[PDB]
């Protein structure tokens, strides 16, 4: 699993065209204030331990930043060892579930299987942009 | 070299704190309209052929998108096989030079060695977000 953590002042997204034949999540949009935006690429090796490591790390980083909202943003482009779309969606659902057991704030999972527009205003402080890798 | 191509409606950045002891580029800011924002991670293996492959690809993609502005945005987070900061800066300078020989529009190289704030509005069409890898 490869993640990119972006500490935003604001964030918003809108699904546009379906990127998959039948996206498993409905279309939609959302916007937010201050949040940790976690761009999330699910990789072949990812299973339940990977999900829980990533959940624990996201919660600790958010703790460090004093963030109270986390956006799990599906992202196909951080890795060249991608899981298949059904496995990725399953892992991302698991990740959202896992994160709720470790982090007390708002967790939002953006829909899976769509092309997106987004806007972000990413903060400039030293810990505002970081990447992570998890395996098992 | 690992790149992320984001076809933006708008883009802007501002240097904040120096991320290196002595950033080799002066502080600053810029904003843009429609552009291809190329987040660029220079890797250990990168040399002159890598630079030219990446220049040629950026020019072709921009051609496909009918983009007339390209932003070369230094980005430490796309890879876990990073070049050292001096080599990376040299490669990025070379990349800007190379791109000017293949692409007729505006090329802007964002400064190197800084923490940045940025804002992007990334388009939602199918080719608006893509990643690339170059080696030699
Ligand atoms: N291994 C993987 N990990 C995470 N997400 C994955 C995935 N495989 C497919 N997706 C999702 O399907 C869309 C098209 O690739 C992806 N959509 C996107 O990456 C948009 N942000 C592009 O505009 C994403 O929803
Ligand atoms: N191998 C590498 N490839 C590309 N850029 C590199 C690099 N090594 C260092 N940098 C630059 O130094 C800043 C701190 O890591 C980097 N700054 C950034 O990545 C900001 N966007 C963070 O806010 C970048 O300017
Ligand atoms: Mg809509
Ligand atoms: Mg300034």
Author numbering:
A (entry chain A), B (entry chain A): 1 to 136
What does the paper say about this structure?
We have been interested in a D-aminoacyl-tRNA deacylase (DTD) fold that is present across the domains of life in two different functional contexts: as an N-terminal editing domain (NTD) of archaeal ThrRS, which specifically removes non-cognate L-serine mischarged on tRNAThr, and as a freestanding ‘chiral proofreading' enzyme, which removes D-amino acids from tRNAs in bacteria and eukaryotes. Both share a striking structural and mechanistic similarity highlighting a common ancestry. Here we show, with the help of structural, biochemical and biophysical studies from three distant organisms, that the substrate specificity in this domain is determined by a differential remodelling of the catalytic centre at the RNA–protein interface rather than just the presence or absence of catalytic water as previously proposed. While demonstrating that the tRNA provides the catalytic group, we show that the side chains within the recognition site are dispensable for the proofreading function, suggesting a primordial mode of protein- or peptide scaffold-based enzymatic activity evolved alongside that of RNA.
However, a direct role of Lys in catalysis is still highly unlikely considering that this position is naturally occupied by a Met in the structural homologue DTD. We solved the crystal structure of K121M mutant of PabNTD and K116M mutant of ApNTD with L-Ser3AA and L-Thr3AA to investigate the structural basis of the observed loss of activity. A significant repositioning of the crucial catalytic water was observed upon mutation of the polar Lys side chain to the non-polar Met side chain, which is present in DTD. This provides a clear structural basis for the loss of function in this mutant, despite its high binding affinity for the substrate. Therefore, we show that Lys plays a crucial role in positioning the water molecule for catalysis rather than acting as a nucleophile.
